[PDB]
Amino acid sequence: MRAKWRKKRMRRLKRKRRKMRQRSK
Amino acid sequence: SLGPQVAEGENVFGVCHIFASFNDTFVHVTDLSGKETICRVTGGMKVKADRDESSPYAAMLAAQDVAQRCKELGITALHIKLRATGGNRTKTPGPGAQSALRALARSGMKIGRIEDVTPIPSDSTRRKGGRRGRRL
Amino acid sequence: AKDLLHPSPEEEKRKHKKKRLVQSPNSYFMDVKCPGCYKITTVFSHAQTVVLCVGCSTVLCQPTGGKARLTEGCSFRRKQ
Amino acid sequence: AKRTKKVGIVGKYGTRYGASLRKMVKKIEISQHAKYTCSFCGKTKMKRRAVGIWHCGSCMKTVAGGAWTYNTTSAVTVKSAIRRLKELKDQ
Amino acid sequence: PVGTMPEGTIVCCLEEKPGDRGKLARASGNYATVISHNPETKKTRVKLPSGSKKVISSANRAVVGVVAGGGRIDKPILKAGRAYHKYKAKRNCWPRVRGVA
Amino acid sequence: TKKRRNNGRAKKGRGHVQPIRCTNCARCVPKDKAIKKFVIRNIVEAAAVRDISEASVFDAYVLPKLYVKLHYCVSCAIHSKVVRNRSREARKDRTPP
Amino acid sequence: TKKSLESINSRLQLVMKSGKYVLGYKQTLKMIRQGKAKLVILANNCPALRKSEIEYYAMLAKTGVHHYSGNNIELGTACGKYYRVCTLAIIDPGDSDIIRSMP
Amino acid sequence: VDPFSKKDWYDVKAPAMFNIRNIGKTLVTRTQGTKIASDGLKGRVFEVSLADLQNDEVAFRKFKLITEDVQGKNCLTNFHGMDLTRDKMCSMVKKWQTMIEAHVDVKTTDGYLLRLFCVGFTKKRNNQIRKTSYAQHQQVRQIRKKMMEIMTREVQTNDLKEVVNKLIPDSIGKDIEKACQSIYPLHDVFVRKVKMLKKPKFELGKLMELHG
RNA sequence: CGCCGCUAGAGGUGAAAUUCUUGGACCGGCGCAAGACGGACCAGAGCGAAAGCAUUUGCCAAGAAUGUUUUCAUUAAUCAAGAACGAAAGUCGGAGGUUCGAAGACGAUCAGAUACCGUCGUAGUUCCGACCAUAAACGAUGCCGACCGGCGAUGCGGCGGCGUUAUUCCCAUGACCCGCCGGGCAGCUUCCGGGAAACCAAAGUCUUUGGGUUCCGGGGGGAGUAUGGUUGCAAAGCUGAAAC
Ligand SMILES: [Mg+2]
Ligand SMILES: [Mg+2]
Ligand SMILES: [Mg+2]
Ligand SMILES: [Mg+2]
Ligand SMILES: [Mg+2]
Ligand SMILES: [Mg+2]
Ligand SMILES: [Mg+2]
Ligand SMILES: [Mg+2]
Ligand SMILES: [Mg+2]
Ligand SMILES: [Mg+2]
Ligand SMILES: [Mg+2]
Ligand SMILES: [Mg+2]
Ligand SMILES: [Mg+2]
Ligand SMILES: [Mg+2]
Ligand SMILES: [Mg+2]
Ligand SMILES: [Mg+2]
Ligand SMILES: [Zn+2]
Ligand SMILES: [Zn+2]
């Protein structure tokens, strides 16, 4: 696994957790 | 028919466009103006196989057919213009031109001066292959 | 063992202006014998501005980067 | 004192009709309510009349301008093309 | 008249037929493009604001420039009140009720 | 580690070089990195020049030359047999005969 | 054109502090009737009636006319004052040569 | 069907004072109702290279012709433009030179206005060690102004007959070569292209004047 | 796209097909329209603080370097906080849409392909207004100042050379050739020394250890992640720990 795609999948997980916080503020 | 000229000693000229690509070879006979097509036989008109229409064996058959039709219609000499896919593709001609020039010079068809009028763009417009392009 | 105390004058001429010891200026003051009536004018060598005689109102030195090129061949002297 | 930080002139509306719509209306409200330099008398008295019409206070020379500015940039391009086609090859 | 002006001239308030006092391109901020003059068979192509290229006569007239008031549809109406005043100024064209409703 | 002092291309003073497309695989490569040569051929292969010389109208008064800027990239140039590999002491060399 | 424009602005800078000049249309009327004015400067966007009247008075009273290609705001900037001016009359230059070079 | 048995042959007459007036023979379908034979033949052009027109000059400097009309089974052509060959244009382009370009519009004496180009390459001197041979670009701007200036006072005061008679020995290129050596020794300055963009009138009387 | 001539195939491949065609494809000759793009000339060349910058001409201000017996008189170097630009991609308005082309749709290979090959094609790629401030933003090498080898070169200024060649002819710049000087992109050799070596005239003047100054590293993961603060319309950016 590339460091680039590890960073982008952790970025997608960060966006998912941000949407979870916006879903339950 | 007799056509253009009787009492030989003066040649009747025609422009022979040869468009060679990596997939097909065009031989085309026009007058000195540029509109009146005299004969036009491609590679696929002489070769049944689609992978062998770019072969130099297709060029011999197409050029002999065109040289036969030109001797039937009565024109003597040819000014050969040579061109390829030069807009964005490879500017070098394909494998058909090397055989087509020999097959025109073999059976009649006295050749005048040959000029390689190839369409060369100014400043390298956008290539079809993309970023990293052709692979294997 | 290079002799830095008493070097060669040709070597110190071929060196740069400020690298040498005394740091003497490479410029000079030249005497132009203007052919107008009689006047001889002292003028700096690397003349930045134009040089006009007050008597004949002719151009003596053209402004040129480096040193000033001259007019018709007036003489010049070196006084140091 | 800087009372408002983002709404500007649009704060007369309030909480209604969207942030992007208020942001897009902000620049053209500033454009229609700003005074412009009169090209004839040199003053800043170009007040907006009805839509498309500008009016200078001094010397009363009413001019037909853009709908929201004094000169549309497309109209300035049209004026440049008109003078180019005028002095190009004598009509 | 459009036969006098050269090609590419940006004009407005032009005419379909010669002598009807201005029909085409009359809305605010619109223009036509004059091209393709012909000495024989006196015609002229004009590019209209819809993008259509119409062949018209060469004797009809047109004022040079664009119509003032361009960019009028840049601002949103932003409420029902300005739409009510706009359509009350224009004509009763606003009983806009949904046909499914 | 470093394989080359020049790091492939010849960019030393400037910071950006315009990419020029390749010929075989058509990849945009900067021109100081891409293999840029200039092929000079006869317009007819030398085994077929004699046939046109025998069947020519003029008495050998025309001899055209075909000049093409050839522009390969180093990813396909090794496959295209131009830029073959060398030794560590052989990478310091110049224009081959 | 840089030589001509920077020359005109430098001559105005020198007349600004060296010589004596008058300002405004009503004062240039008295100066062009008394004949003290030698050169007048009109703005680009001055109105045509005032422009033709000042040109008529100058060509009756043997006075040069210079049309300054510029708005009256930058003409006031060129004469060096914060307001705007459309009509100048250089009645006495200090060390300049506006009334010598151009006419 | 055999349409070439029905097709007709017209021979092409070049205009005067090249050396001769022979070009070749072209195909005409025939005249049939609306399609007159003098319709497309007026629009047909030609593109011919030398050693047959200019009485044994160089093989490059091609010529672009266009047929004005036909007169007694002989279609008479007229000058349309002038080009050079691809191998000559791509030749004399060395990797260590400086290629100076120029182009200018100019009107002739009559109602013909044309657009002509100019190409120049640098020249290494005899016994020169420095292989670069570049310029300071101020002489390049000055020589672009110079080559734009020379073509004005040739082609403005001369119409087609005199400018073709000046392009017979390439006197424009030799004049630029003579007036060029004070700046730089530039190598084989040619014009490389000129084409006609505006044509005023048919002018059969001026064509008879071109015949003489 | 408009016409003209001929004709059964033309594109696309390792090989075929998806695509268009007697409703004329493709090919040649002429004209028009659209927008993108500045090759060859173009180089271990130049400029710019970097990102970056290549058709001609005009205008607008700017700057390096050089030549200065010209001017002021320590006005200087690096920088917490703060600020100006900042490739490409992405977001919000207005104009169109040439080519390419994320996604998407098929046609092929493959046991399996949605990928590598091909055909069509949206967003985008263009320009004008704003936002985002990121890269292998590289020379993986902070800035200023001195010293410590040579050589052949290149570009930019200055100087010298009854040397060579160009105008019409003394008068002056033009081009070549030889040498020197100032900073610059550079190359070869070397035991001058460093370093683990590759390699480096800097990555040297470091146990014989100290010229000034700014920022960061303390095994690998967790992790540039979580929680806070802050900027942004958003994607996200900056600061950024602990358990194990
Ligand atoms: Mg990757
Ligand atoms: Mg809208
Ligand atoms: Mg509705
Ligand atoms: Mg409703
Ligand atoms: Mg490796
Ligand atoms: Mg970079
Ligand atoms: Mg169909
Ligand atoms: Mg075609
Ligand atoms: Mg960007
Ligand atoms: Mg939107
Ligand atoms: Mg496509
Ligand atoms: Mg996929
Ligand atoms: Mg989106
Ligand atoms: Mg970073
Ligand atoms: Mg730093
Ligand atoms: Mg020099
Ligand atoms: Zn007013
Ligand atoms: Zn390649």
Residue B130, classified by CB atoms within 10 Å of its CB into exposed (0-12), middle (13-18) or buried (19+), is exposed
Nearest Cβ partner of B3 from H9, H24, H46?
A: H9
In D, which residues are within 8 Å of G72 by CB distance? 42
Q: How far apart are CA D53 and CA E70, in angstroms?
A: 11
According to DSSP, residue C47 is labeled -
Query: In 3D, which of E49, E51, E46 has the Cα closest to residue E61?
Result: E46
Question: Resolution reached, in Å?
Answer: 3.6
Q: How far apart are CA G15 and CA G80, in angstroms?
A: 10
CB contact under 8 A, B105 and F27: no
Question: In terms of residues, how long is chain C?
Answer: 80
Pairing state of beta strands E53-57 and E43-47?
antiparallel
G87 in contact with chain D, both atoms CB, cutoff 8 A:
no
CB C45 within 8 A of CB C31: no
Pairing state of beta strands B77-84 and B13-20?
parallel
H48 in contact with chain B, both atoms CB, cutoff 8 A:
yes
Question: For the CA atoms of H192, H196, H197, H200, what is the dihedral angle to 10 degrees?
Answer: 160
Query: In 3D, which of B38, B37, B44 has the Cα closest to residue B21?
Result: B44
- Chain F window 1-40: residues with CB closer than 7 Å to nucleic chain I are 1-2, 5-7, 10-16, 18, 20, 31-32, 36, 38
Query: In 3D, which of B110, B120, B114 has the Cα closest to residue B97?
Result: B114
CB B84 within 8 A of CB B20: yes
CB G76 within 8 A of CB G85: yes
Structure tokens at E75: 């601002």
C23 backbone dihedrals φ, ψ, rounded to 5°: 55, 50
Touch criterion met for G and A (3+ Cβ pairs within 8 Å) = no
Over the range H192-212, which residues count as b (16 or more CB within 10 Å of their CB) and which as e? bbbebeeeeeeeeebeeebee
Q: How far apart are CA D43 and CA D22, in angstroms?
A: 31
B77 in contact with chain H, both atoms CB, cutoff 8 A:
no
B82 backbone dihedrals φ, ψ, rounded to 5°: -120, 135
CB B12 within 8 A of CB B74: yes
Structure tokens at H184: 């730089």
- Chain H window 117-136: residues with CB closer than 7 Å to nucleic chain I are 125, 127-130, 132-134, 136
Q: Print the domain residue range for B51.
A: 1-136
**Pairs across B and F, CB distance < 8 A:** 72
A5 backbone dihedrals φ, ψ, rounded to 5°: -80, -25
- With a 7 Å cutoff on the CB, does H74 touch strand I? no
According to DSSP, residue F56 is labeled B
Ramachandran assignment for G82, one of left (phi > 0), alpha (psi -120 to 50 degrees), beta (any other) = alpha
Touch criterion met for B and F (3+ Cβ pairs within 8 Å) = yes
Cα-based distances in Å from E90 to B78, D2, E84, E86, E93: 74, 41, 10, 6, 8
Q: How far apart are CA B79 and CA B75, in angstroms?
A: 12
Q: How far apart are CA H152 and CA H146, in angstroms?
A: 10
Interface test with chain G among D36, D41, D61, by most G beta carbons within 10 Å? D41
Q: How far apart are CA B25 and CA B102, in angstroms?
A: 14
What CATH number did the domain enclosing B103 receive? 3.30.420.80
Query: In 3D, which of B118, H95, B131 has the Cα closest to residue F21?
Result: B131
Q: How far is H50 from chain F (nearest CA, A)?
A: 11
Q: How far apart are CA B78 and CA B18, in angstroms?
A: 12
Nearest Cβ partner of F27 from B98, B124, B132?
A: B132
CB contact under 8 A, B105 and F66: no
Query: In 3D, which of G99, G103, G100, G57 has the Cα closest to residue G87?
Result: G57
The full DSSP string for D11-62 is: GGT-S-S-HHHHHHHHHHHHHHHS-B--TTT-SS-EEE-STTEEEESSTT--
Q: In C1-80, which residue ranges form alpha helices assigned H by DSSP?
A: 9-14
- With a 7 Å cutoff on the CB, does C33 touch strand I? no
Distance H55 CA to I92 C1' (A): 69
Residue B75, classified by CB atoms within 10 Å of its CB into exposed (0-12), middle (13-18) or buried (19+), is buried
Q: Give H134's contacts (C-beta < 8 A, 6+ positions apart).
A: H98, H122
Q: Specify the DSSP element, H or E, that contains H11.
A: strand H8-13
D56 is in an annotated binding site: yes
Q: How is the beta sheet containing D46-48 ordered, strand by strand?
A: D46-48, D53-56, D63-64
Nearest Cβ partner of H45 from B12, B34, B36?
A: B34
Structure tokens at B104: 């025109």
D29 is in an annotated binding site: no
Helix axes H171-180, H138-155, angle to 10 degrees: 140
In B, which residues are within 8 Å of F18 by CB distance? none
User: How many structural domains compose chain B?
Assistant: 1
According to DSSP, residue E42 is labeled -
Q: How far is F87 from chain B (nearest CA, A)?
A: 27
E35 in contact with chain D, both atoms CB, cutoff 8 A:
no
